[PDB]
Amino acid sequence: KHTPINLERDLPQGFSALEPLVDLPIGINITRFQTLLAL
Amino acid sequence: GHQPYRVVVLSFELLHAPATVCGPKKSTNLVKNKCVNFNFNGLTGTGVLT
Numbered sequence A: 001k002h003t004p005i006n007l008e009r010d011l012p013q014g015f016s017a018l019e020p021l022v023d024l025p026i027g028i029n030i031t032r033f034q035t036l037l038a039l
Numbered sequence B: 001g002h003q004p005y006r007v008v009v010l011s012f013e014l015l016h017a018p019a020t021v022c023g024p025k026k027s028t029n030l031v032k033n034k035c036v037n038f039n040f041n042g043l044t045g046t047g048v049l050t
């Protein structure tokens, strides 16, 4: 969900639902995940 | 008996995984304003389509 946020340093006091995007039949297990950045 | 022959072999298998591979699915036309049965993508019932 992409929410246009006014100038604030914290999560706003509001409600917003999260719509589904895609489902994938992978049949694998997940235990850890990481982050990726560009420089 | 000594001429070249091309051979193709097809193999299938099952296991604990989603199928994700299936053949053709037939379809019918759409009707309205009549008491008719329907099968709308895995859902079965009877009623009037409007």
Ligand SMILES: *[C@@H]1O[C@H](CO)[C@@H](O)[C@H](O)[C@H]1NC(C)=O
Binding pocket: A027, A028, A029, A030
């Ligand atoms: C993932 O690993 C757990 C145990 O670590 C196992 O029980 C589960 O079946 C695995 N899932 C897979 C391989 O999809």
